[PDB]
Amino acid sequence: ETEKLIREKDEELRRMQEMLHKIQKQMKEN
Amino acid sequence: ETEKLIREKDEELRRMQEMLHKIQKQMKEN
Numbered sequence: 434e435t436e437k438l439i440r441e442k443d444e445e446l447r448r449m450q451e452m453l454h455k456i457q458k459q460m461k462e463n
Numbered sequence: 464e465t466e467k468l469i470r471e472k473d474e475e476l477r478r479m480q481e482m483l484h485k486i487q488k489q490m491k492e493n
Contacts, residue, residue, distance in 0.1 A: 436490065443483050446476050453473050460466065 436487070439483055439487055439490075443480055446480050446483070450473055450476050453469055453476070457466075457469055460469075
């Protein structure tokens with residue numbers, strides 16, 4: 434259970450970085 | 464300034480992942 438919870442938190446942090454990268458790409462296109 | 468701010472947030476997210484990986488390693492070790 435705890436191991437899965439920590440993996441979920443790592444996934445959340447990756448998704449947050451994916452969003453920031455998409456903003457960076459759109460700012461470069463702008 | 465905003466470009467630097469977004470890079471700073473990405474660095475923060477990577478440091479949070481580094482911390483989770485250290486916890487994962489220590490849990491596996493016991």
